[PDB]
Amino acid sequence: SEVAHRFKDLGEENFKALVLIAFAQYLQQCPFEDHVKLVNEVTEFAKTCVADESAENCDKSLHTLFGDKLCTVADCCAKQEPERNECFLQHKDDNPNLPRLVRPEVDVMCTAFHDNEETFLKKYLYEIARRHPYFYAPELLFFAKRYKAAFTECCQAADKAACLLPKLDELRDEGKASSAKQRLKCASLQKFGERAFKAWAVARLSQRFPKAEFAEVSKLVTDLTKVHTECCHGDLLECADDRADLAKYICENQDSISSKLKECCEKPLLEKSHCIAEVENDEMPADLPSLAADFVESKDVCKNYAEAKDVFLGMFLYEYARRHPDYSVVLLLRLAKTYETTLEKCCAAADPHECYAKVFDEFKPLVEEPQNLIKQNCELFEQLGEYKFQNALLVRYTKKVPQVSTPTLVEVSRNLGKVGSKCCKHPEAKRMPCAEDYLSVVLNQLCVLHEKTPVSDRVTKCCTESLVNRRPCFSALEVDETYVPKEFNAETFTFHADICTLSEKERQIKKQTALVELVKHKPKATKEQLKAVMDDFAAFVEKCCKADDKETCFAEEGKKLVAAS
Numbered sequence: 001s002e003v004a005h006r007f008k009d010l011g012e013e014n015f016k017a018l019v020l021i022a023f024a025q026y027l028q029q030c031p032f033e034d035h036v037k038l039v040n041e042v043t044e045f046a047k048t049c050v051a052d053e054s055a056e057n058c059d060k061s062l063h064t065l066f067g068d069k070l071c072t073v074a075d076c077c078a079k080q081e082p083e084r085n086e087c088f089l090q091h092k093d094d095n096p097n098l099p100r101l102v103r104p105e106v107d108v109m110c111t112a113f114h115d116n117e118e119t120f121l122k123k124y125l126y127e128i129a130r131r132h133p134y135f136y137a138p139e140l141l142f143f144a145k146r147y148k149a150a151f152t153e154c155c156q157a158a159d160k161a162a163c164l165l166p167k168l169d170e171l172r173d174e175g176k177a178s179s180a181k182q183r184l185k186c187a188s189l190q191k192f193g194e195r196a197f198k199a200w201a202v203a204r205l206s207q208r209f210p211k212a213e214f215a216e217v218s219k220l221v222t223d224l225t226k227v228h229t230e231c232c233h234g235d236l237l238e239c240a241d242d243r244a245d246l247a248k249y250i251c252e253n254q255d256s257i258s259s260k261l262k263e264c265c266e267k268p269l270l271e272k273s274h275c276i277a278e279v280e281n282d283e284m285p286a287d288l289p290s291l292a293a294d295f296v297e298s299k300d301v302c303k304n305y306a307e308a309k310d311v312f313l314g315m316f317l318y319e320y321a322r323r324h325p326d327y328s329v330v331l332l333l334r335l336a337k338t339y340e341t342t343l344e345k346c347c348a349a350a351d352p353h354e355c356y357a358k359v360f361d362e363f364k365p366l367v368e369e370p371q372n373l374i375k376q377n378c379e380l381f382e383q384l385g386e387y388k389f390q391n392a393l394l395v396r397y398t399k400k401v402p403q404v405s406t407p408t409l410v411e412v413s414r415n416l417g418k419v420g421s422k423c424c425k426h427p428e429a430k431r432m433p434c435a436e437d438y439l440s441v442v443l444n445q446l447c448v449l450h451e452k453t454p455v456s457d458r459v460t461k462c463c464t465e466s467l468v469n470r471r472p473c474f475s476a477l478e479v480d481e482t483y484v485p486k487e488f489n490a491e492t493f494t495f496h497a498d499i500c501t502l503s504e505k506e507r508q509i510k511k512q513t514a515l516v517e518l519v520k521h522k523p524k525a526t527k528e529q530l531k532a533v534m535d536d537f538a539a540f541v542e543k544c545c546k547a548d549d550k551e552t553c554f555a556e557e558g559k560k561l562v563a564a565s
């Protein structure tokens with residue numbers, strides 16, 4: 001019995017939490033009570049399967065059981081058992097149409113938390129899982145614990161708010177980043193294949209554990225790949241289980257992997273896993289030989305490449321990565337790709353060595369492009385500040401791909417602008433991996449949000465031609481020349497002065513949702529005049545809100561401000 005096996009392994013509490021998450025991210029629209037009901041039913045069926053390991057249908061796979069259960073509250077269900085599952089996965093909505101969740105006053109939360117604790121927690125997982133269908137399940141358990149600790153500690157102190165609100169924000173943020181990072185790992189596996197994912201891990205783990213040996217790193221990558229293959233496919237229970245087995249292993253071999261795995265291995269399961277996943281890069285091994293020796297000077301290259309190209313190319317990436325934590329993971333993959341393309345062409349020639357001898361020479365432009373890009377943007381950022389930098393980015397992206405919907409552009413550009421504060425404060429040595437790998441996560445968001453309802457062949461081409469070159473592809477785009485300006489209309493922007501009650505930030509989002517709309521009418525409008533038409537609008541909500549009158553200006557000053565623009 002598979003259901004029984006996972007129950008004993010994970011326990012009862014984690015078991016219940018994981019099924020809730022799996023169900024919440026399969027049917028994101030259904031109510032809490034429905035999932036809660038289905039979860040308990042399943043758990044009871046799991047208990048009766050523990051005793052009699054051959055009861056009702058304790059033989060059925062996790063898929064079938066979970067599948068039949070959801071089909072009691074829902075096309076997809078009219079399918080059979082392999083693919084009826086694939087049907088569900090295909091309908092996960094990355095941008096669900098769900099109500100903006102808002103936190104009541106601290107007093108209503110502490111009561112709810114104190115009265116029924118298990119319920120207050122199940123609701124956390126449900127609200128988070130249904131809005132982030134690819135959220136890394138095992139980590140959602142880790143955050144749940146931290147959430148519980150925020151309430152347990154703060155709901156007793158003096159200023160509860162001054163103790164809870166800050167920690168719940170640090171959580172919400174760390175959570176969005178975690179969700180984005182995981183959405184990319186799932187996109188790699190699902191759109192590009194496990195080989196693209198393994199190349200990514202080999203490179204990332206080699207930077208983190210330079211003292212590990214290719215054979216050890218290769219084992220780690222293999223396991224990590226299964227964990228993610230499973231989590232990204234909805235096999236939440238075996239993902240959590242297998243993720244525990246990997247944490248166990250890594251600690252039982254700290255010495256053959258990394259020294260900085262200390263603190264990690266001296267703590268709770270959930271936290272140990274989290275710690276290992278974010279541990280800092282180890283110190284680079286003593287004296288490592290030159291890469292040129294075994295990869296460009298040697299005469300066996302083409303022979304080794306023929307013998308086992310995959311193993312050989314993995315070795316190249318591992319070697320180049322372990323000694324370059326100053327390079328972003330995608331640049332490493334890019335270099336590895338250039339090496340591959342060269343051996344493929346050179347090894348088919350007469351004198352191979354002479355052909356692939358100056359391969360490192362082709363690496364030069366590849367390394368310098370990202371470095372110049374990070375410098376140019378941190379400079380702009382530093383002098384303009386976040387808000388202004390995001391605006392500079394909004395005009396740029398809207399001109400690049402005018403078809404994309406205003407909400408996606410505004411959302412994607414605001415995140416792109418956060419690279420400024422997230423990375424520019426580091427020393428040039430750690431800026432690239434920080435910047436480019438972060439830009440990869442955000443651009444992935446644009447690719448998945450756009451993939452649903454495509455409207456731009458330019459976004460589609462950059463998103464699907466190559467995972468590693470996504471950032472450079474978008475960077476090479478300029479202004480869409482074939483775009484035909486939008487026709488202005490009334491409802492273009494509901495100037496309803498209900499914005500005066502909105503937070504200073506949602507006011508910027510609305511003030512940015514307008515800048516996008518304008519640039520769509522005046523693609524050719526210079527950044528100059530645009531950098532002025534904003535002030536003209538800031539004046540609007542300014543006077544209109546402070547003015548003690550009806551929504552007049554929202555109608556009068558609004559339809560009159562249009563003539564002034």
Ligand SMILES: C=CC1=C(C)/C(=C\c2[nH]c(/C=C3N=C(/C=C4\NC(=O)C(C)=C4C=C)C(C)=C\3CCC(=O)O)c(CCC(=O)O)c2C)NC1=O
Nearest residue numbers: 101102103104108109112124127128143168171172175176
């Ligand atoms: C009285 C009880 C009660 C509350 C408090 C409630 C609303 C409510 N609003 C929330 C905000 C939210 N919290 C998140 C996200 C996260 N938050 C995280 O801890 C993590 C790890 C993520 C990442 C996925 C989001 C997206 C929202 C709503 C929109 C936003 O502000 O970002 C949350 C999630 C937990 C939190 O961030 O504090 C709840 C439960 N409804 C209720 O009945």
